[PDB]
C-alpha cells in the first residue's frame, strides 16, 4: 500500500497508561537480559507500574521519616527507616546493605539498670 | 536412668533413613493449608513426600542449632528461648 | 624509596590497625553494653575471613574484564552473589 | 537541517581540536542508564515540598536495577517451568505473588491490572 | 421515528456503573449488590456536596468568583485527614497533568 | 467531527468528569468554573471510591464472601481511623456493628485477657 | 500415530551410572540415588550457567566461551575443587581442538 | 557421522545436551564452541569424584 496518512494511532510515549517511568527502556532491558525468547508489550508496562508504585511508596514514607528528622532533602537514613519500619518492606529488603545508612533505636531491656541500682538488699553495695 | 535411652535414640535415628512425622496427619495438613489459598487442589504421591522431607530436614537442622544454644546457656534442654534465638540469628524469622 | 625494599616478617600487623575504639563504636551501635577483651582479636579475625571470601569472587570478576583496576561494579557482583547486596555505588 | 544517516557521522566528537567555535566538548561515554529524572518526577507528585540528595538518588538507581533483575529474573524462571517462550502479563503477575509479600503483591497486582486495562481500550 | 414510547426516561444522576467499574479494576473477581451500590451512590453524592460546598465557601471568602483546582486542593486538605489528603492531592496532581498534556 | 475521546479518557479517568462539570454549575457554587476543577474533583472521588471498595473486598474476604454487601461497607468504615473520622456521624443502611466489648463485661470481674485469636 | 509418548526427559542418571562404572566398575547404583544425582547435576549446571550468563552481561558481550565458564568455575567451586576442575576443563578443550 | 563431540574430548557426559540447554535457557545471544566442552568436563569431574 505505502499510503501516506496522518497520526491515527497514539503518537505518545509508550507509557500510555499514565505511567511516568519509561516502559520502553524496560522493554529493551528485557531483551538485553535475554529473559525470554519473545517479549510482549504487556510486560514492560506491567513492570513499570509495579516499579512506579514501589518508587512512590518508598519516597512517601521516606519523606515522612524526613519530617520526623526535620529535613527537606531525603537522605539514606530516611530511606532506611522506611524499609525497616514495616515488616513487608523489611522482609523483602532483608539482607541488603544501604549506603550511608543508620541503625534504628532498638535497645534491649536488660541493659537499662533502673530498679534500685543502689543494691538488691538495701541502699548500697 | 532418666535420659539413658535418649543417647540410645541418637544411634538408631541417625542411621535409619526414614521419616518421623506421621504421614496421614501430614497428608491432611497440606490440604488444609493449600485449600485456604485456593480451592480444589489435587495432590500427588511424590508431592506429599517431597514436601514432608523438606519440612523434616528443616526441623532437624533447626534442632541442631537449638542444641548449640542449650550448651551456650549451660543447659541440656531446648526451652522455647533456643528456637526463638535460632530463627532470628539464621534470618528465617524475618 | 624505590625498588623492592620489601621487609616481610613471619607475622603481620596491618590487621591490628583496627583497634579497640574502632571495635567499640560498632559494639555500641549494635547496643552491646560491654565487650570482652578477646572479642577485639576475634572481631579482627572475623573481618579477615569475611574480606577474604569477598575478594576471592571480586578478583575473578576483575581479571575476567582484563582490568588492572578494581571498580565499584566488580565488588557489587561479589557482594550480590554472596547475598550481601549493597545499594549506593554503581547501577 | 540536513540528512545525517550516513555512517561517517555515527561515531564522532573526537578531540582532534578541529574547532570553529564552542571549544569545550569531549567524547561520548557509555550511557550509564539511570532513573533519576523519573524518581525525582514521581517524588514531586506525592510530596511537592520534599527534596532529595544525590546519595539517595544513587541508592534508588541501584534499587530499581536490582529489583528489575529480581522480578524479571524470576519471571523467566517460571516461563521455562511451564514450557513457555512468551512473557506478556501472566509470568510477572505470578512472579509478583512469588517475589513480593502478601500486601505488597496485592498493591502491585491491583495497579498492574489497572495499568494494562488503561494501556488497552484505546488507540 | 419520533418519541413513541416515553414518560419513563429520567434520573440518570447515579454513580452505580462507575462504582461497579472501579471495583473490577482493583478487584476483578469480586461482586457487589444493589444495597451496597446504593450506599456508594449516596457516598459519592454526600462527599461531592461536602467538597463542592467547601469550594463554594472559599470562592465567596476570597472573592475569586471562580472554581479551579486550587480551590479543591484547599478543600481536600480541610475535609480529608492527613493520610487521605496526601493521596487525594497526589491523584489530583497526577490527573491534571495528563489532561493538559494532550487532547 | 465526532466524540473521539471523552474527558475522562483524555485524563485517564473512569468517573464522569463531564457530569461533575454540570453538577458544579447546577449547584450554583460560583459564578464561573475552571477546567482544572472537574479533573481534580473526579480523581479525588475515584481514589475514595476505589480504596473503600478495596477495603470492602478485604473485609468480604475475612467474612468469606465475594459479593460486597452493606455489612462489609460498615466494617471497613469503622476499622480505619481516617475513615472513622469522615464517616463517624453518617449511618450505613443494613450495616452491622464491630465486635467491641468493654473490660467489665467479660466473665471475670474487670479482666480482658483472652486467647490470641481476636482482640 | 502409534503409541508415541517419547517426550524427551532431560536426565543424567544413565550418564551418572556410566561414569560410576568407570571409577568403581564393580559397583551398582539404586534408582533413588540416581534421582538425587540427576537433580544435583542439573542444579549445578543451572548455577554455573546462571553465573556464566551474568559474566557475559557484565562485560557487555552477551557471548559465552570457555573463559566465561572458567571464571564461573573459579567463583563457586572451592580452592581444591576448582583447580582440579579447571585442569579437567582445560584438558577437554585442548583434546577436542585436535580432532577430526 | 563416526564420532561425537563428547567422545572427541574424552568426556562421557553429553556435551551437545549441555549446548541445547544453554541455548534453551537463553543465557547468551551467541555461544562459543569451547563453552559446553568446559562445562561438561567440570560437571563430569564433580560426578566422578562424588561417586568415588
TrEMBL record, chain A:
Keywords: Acetylation, Chromosome, DNA-binding, Isopeptide bond, Nucleosome core, Nucleus, Phosphoprotein, Ubl conjugation. One of its GO terms (molecular function) is protein heterodimerization activity. Residues 2-84 form the Core Histone H2A/H2B/H3 domain. Residues 1-17 are annotated as: Disordered. GO terms for biological process: heterochromatin formation. GO terms for cellular component: nucleosome; nucleus. The keyword Phosphoprotein applies. Residues 2-14 have a biased composition (Basic residues). Residues 87-120 form the Histone H2A C-terminal domain. It is found in: Chromosome; Nucleus. PANTHER family: HISTONE H2A. Belongs to the histone H2A family. The nucleosome is a histone octamer containing two molecules each of H2A, H2B, H3 and H4 assembled in one H3-H4 heterotetramer and two H2A-H2B heterodimers. The octamer wraps approximately 147 bp of DNA. Core component of nucleosome. Nucleosomes wrap and compact DNA into chromatin, limiting DNA accessibility to the cellular machineries which require DNA as a template. Histones thereby play a central role in transcription regulation, DNA repair, DNA replication and chromosomal stability. DNA accessibility is regulated via a complex set of post-translational modifications of histones, also called histone code, and nucleosome remodeling. This is Histone H2A. The gene is LOC494591.
Automatic annotation (TrEMBL), chain B:
It is found in: Chromosome; Nucleus. Residues 2-89 form the Core Histone H2A/H2B/H3 domain. GO terms for cellular component: nucleosome; nucleus. Its main location: nucleus. Keywords: Acetylation, ADP-ribosylation, Chromosome, DNA-binding, Hydroxylation, Methylation, Nucleosome core, Nucleus, Ubl conjugation. The keyword Ubl conjugation applies. GO terms for molecular function: DNA binding; protein heterodimerization activity; structural constituent of chromatin. Belongs to the histone H3 family. The nucleosome is a histone octamer containing two molecules each of H2A, H2B, H3 and H4 assembled in one H3-H4 heterotetramer and two H2A-H2B heterodimers. The octamer wraps approximately 147 bp of DNA. This is Histone H3. The lineage of its organism: Eukaryota, Metazoa, Chordata, Craniata, Vertebrata.
From TrEMBL, chain F:
PANTHER family: HISTONE H2A. Belongs to the histone H2A family. This is Histone H2A. The nucleosome is a histone octamer containing two molecules each of H2A, H2B, H3 and H4 assembled in one H3-H4 heterotetramer and two H2A-H2B heterodimers. The octamer wraps approximately 147 bp of DNA. PROSITE patterns: HISTONE_H2A (PS00046). The lineage of its organism: Eukaryota, Metazoa, Chordata, Craniata, Vertebrata. CDD domains: HFD_H2A. Residues 1-78 form the Core Histone H2A/H2B/H3 domain. GO terms for molecular function: DNA binding; protein heterodimerization activity; structural constituent of chromatin.
Amino acid at each position: 500500500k505505502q499510503g501516506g496518512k496522518t497520526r491515527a494511532k497514539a503518537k505518545t510515549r509508550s507509557s500510555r497508561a499514565g505511567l511516568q517511568f519509561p516502559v520502553g527502556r524496560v522493554h529493551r532491558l528485557l531483551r538485553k537480559g535475554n529473559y525470554a525468547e519473545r517479549v510482549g508489550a504487556g510486560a514492560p508496562v506491567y513492570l513499570a507500574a509495579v516499579l512506579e508504585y514501589l518508587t512512590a511508596e518508598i519516597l512517601e514514607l521516606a519523606g515522612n521519616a524526613a519530617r520526623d528528622n526535620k529535613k527537606t532533602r531525603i537522605i539514606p537514613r530516611h530511606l532506611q527507616l522506611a524499609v525497616r519500619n514495616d515488616e513487608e518492606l523489611n522482609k523483602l529488603l532483608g539482607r541488603v546493605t544501604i549506603a550511608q545508612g543508620g541503625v534504628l533505636p532498638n535497645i534491649q531491656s536488660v541493659l537499662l539498670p533502673k530498679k534500685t541500682e543502689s543494691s538488691k538488699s538495701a541502699k548500697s553495695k | 536412668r532418666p535420659g539413658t535411652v535418649a543417647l540410645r535414640e541418637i544411634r538408631r535415628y541417625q542411621k535409619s533413613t526414614e521419616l518421623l512425622i506421621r504421614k496421614l496427619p501430614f497428608q491432611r495438613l497440606v490440604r488444609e493449608i493449600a485449600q485456604d489459598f485456593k480451592t480444589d487442589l489435587r495432590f500427588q504421591s511424590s508431592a506429599v513426600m517431597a514436601l514432608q522431607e523438606a519440612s523434616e530436614a528443616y526441623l532437624v537442622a533447626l534442632f541442631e542449632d537449638t542444641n548449640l544454644c542449650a550448651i551456650h546457656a549451660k543447659r541440656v534442654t531446648i526451652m522455647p528461648k533456643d528456637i526463638q534465638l535460632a530463627r532470628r540469628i539464621r534470618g528465617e524469622r524475618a | 624509596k624505590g625498588g623492592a625494599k620489601r621487609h616481610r616478617k613471619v607475622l603481620r600487623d596491618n590487621i591490628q590497625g583496627i583497634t579497640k575504639p574502632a571495635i567499640r563504636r560498632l559494639a555500641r551501635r549494635g547496643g552491646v553494653k560491654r565487650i570482652s577483651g578477646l572479642i577485639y582479636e576475634e572481631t579482627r579475625g572475623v573481618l579477615k575471613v569475611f574480606l577474604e571470601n569477598v575478594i576471592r569472587d571480586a578478583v575473578t570478576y576483575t581479571e575476567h574484564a582484563k582490568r588492572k583496576t578494581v571498580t565499584a561494579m566488580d565488588v557489587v557482583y561479589a557482594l550480590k552473589r554472596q547475598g550481601r547486596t549493597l545499594y549506593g555505588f554503581g547501577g | 537541517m540536513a540528512k545525517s544517516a550516513p555512517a561517517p557521522k555515527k561515531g564522532s566528537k573526537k578531540a582532534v581540536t578541529k574547532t570553529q567555535k564552542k571549544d569545550g566538548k569531549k567524547r561520548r561515554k557509555s550511557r550509564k542508564e539511570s532513573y533519576a529524572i523519573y524518581v525525582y518526577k514521581v517524588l514531586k507528585q506525592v510530596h511537592p515540598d520534599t527534596g532529595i540528595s544525590s546519595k539517595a538518588m544513587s541508592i534508588m538507581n541501584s534499587f530499581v536495577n536490582d529489583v528489575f533483575e529480581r522480578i524479571a529474573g524470576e519471571a523467566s524462571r517460571l516461563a521455562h517451568y511451564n514450557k513457555r517462550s512468551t512473557i506478556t502479563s501472566r509470568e510477572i503477575q505470578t512472579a509478583v505473588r512469588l517475589l513480593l509479600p502478601g500486601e505488597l503483591a496485592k498493591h502491585a497486582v491491583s495497579e498492574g491490572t489497572k495499568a494494562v486495562t488503561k494501556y488497552t481500550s484505546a488507540k
